[PDB]
Amino acid sequence: MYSDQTYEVIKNRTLENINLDIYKGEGSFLNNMVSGNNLELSKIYLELSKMHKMAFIQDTYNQFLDKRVNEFGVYRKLGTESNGEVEFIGEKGTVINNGTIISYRDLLFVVIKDVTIGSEEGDNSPVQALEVGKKYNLPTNCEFKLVDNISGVTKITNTRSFEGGTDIETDEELKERFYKIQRNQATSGNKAHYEEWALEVDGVYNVKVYPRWDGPGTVKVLIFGKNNQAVDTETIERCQQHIDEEKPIGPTITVVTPLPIEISISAVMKLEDGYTLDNVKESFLESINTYFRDIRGEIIYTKVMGILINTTGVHDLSNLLINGSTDNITINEDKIPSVTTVNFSE
């Protein structure tokens, strides 16, 4: 509606609404006055459009994103302070009290432990930055100057780089995180929660969840390794204990691992300018694993041909053989295809 009303349309409507014998046209009294008023008239419609755009935080960092994400529970991060430890070189018997302040150029730091020089506890004491920011992620072998003078000290330095200093969460990252969280559906005990709890664990790259596999109160967790490979017993155990810690009280979780199918893939392809065979191979590996996890039934030669040809870097393909044939390979129960070798000729 605000976009519908434009300068020309409103000017024409105003001119037509005047039912008088005088003339309307270029270089006319009424025409000039009407245009001069309608400019300010349409300014309001343009401002209304901008106001509506800001209200629903569509673009260009409208200041209302903060309030909307506070509505939706999202919070910005101010960063975490850099942490480290320094060594005190000086006279034996000199004690550095907890809270003693030191500085590195414009940066300032505080000592976290009561340290005495030459002691059996050593001359090293943890040190934390007073302020957040990646600027406090100090490198190694830095000289630290004490803001307040203490007798007996000569030199203060750190054996290795400070870590942990991070900046405040920028607004673009905030918007991206809000979008990703909105895409996710995290609810108490749901299948998506099982998937999330499973993917947090190392050694698990793909998650499939089977509810009520053994009647009510039973959840079957199907996890996959890298390149859709079998998950090891220890990795299955850690995934099981993690989900048990994160599973609701009462359910029982059972985890099984897939069984691979060895497949030989071979093709003759022409590459576009600026790409290599390794990039084609790795992108094909990812794409074929993605096709593997979603497939049920039999592997299909022409789907593989399409996925390979859609791969970025491949301008042509020819002589494509799956296990030395151009026929569909039937996948049986408890079996999953697993890429084994990639023989590509340019």
Partner: protein, 83 residues
């Protein structure tokens, strides 16, 4: 206690020595649940007083977080309240 009071929006100094310099002074007879207790002149470890003559703390390297009886600590120096 940094973590515990951050969980209730109470920001405290990172080091316990500075933590002694925050909040109203508390006496040993006016100790209540939630108070902070400091004993040695260097506050190597600060306890969280939960009442009943007991308090929670991290003792030192090699020990683990547990509940200590206040009377066993003859070295009491001062106490503060920030809640």
């Amino acid at each position: 206690m940094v973590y515990c009071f951050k969980k209730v929006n109470v920001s405290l100094p990172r080091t316990s020595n500075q933590q002694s310099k925050k909040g109203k002074k508390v006496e040993q007879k006016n100790l209540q649940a939630g108070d902070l207790v400091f004993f040695h002149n260097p506050v190597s470890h600060v306890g969280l007083y939960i009442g009943n003559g007991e308090f929670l703390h991290a003792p030192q390297k090699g020990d683990v977080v547990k509940i200590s009886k206040l009377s066993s600590r003859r070295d009491f120096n001062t106490a503060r309240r920030v809640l």
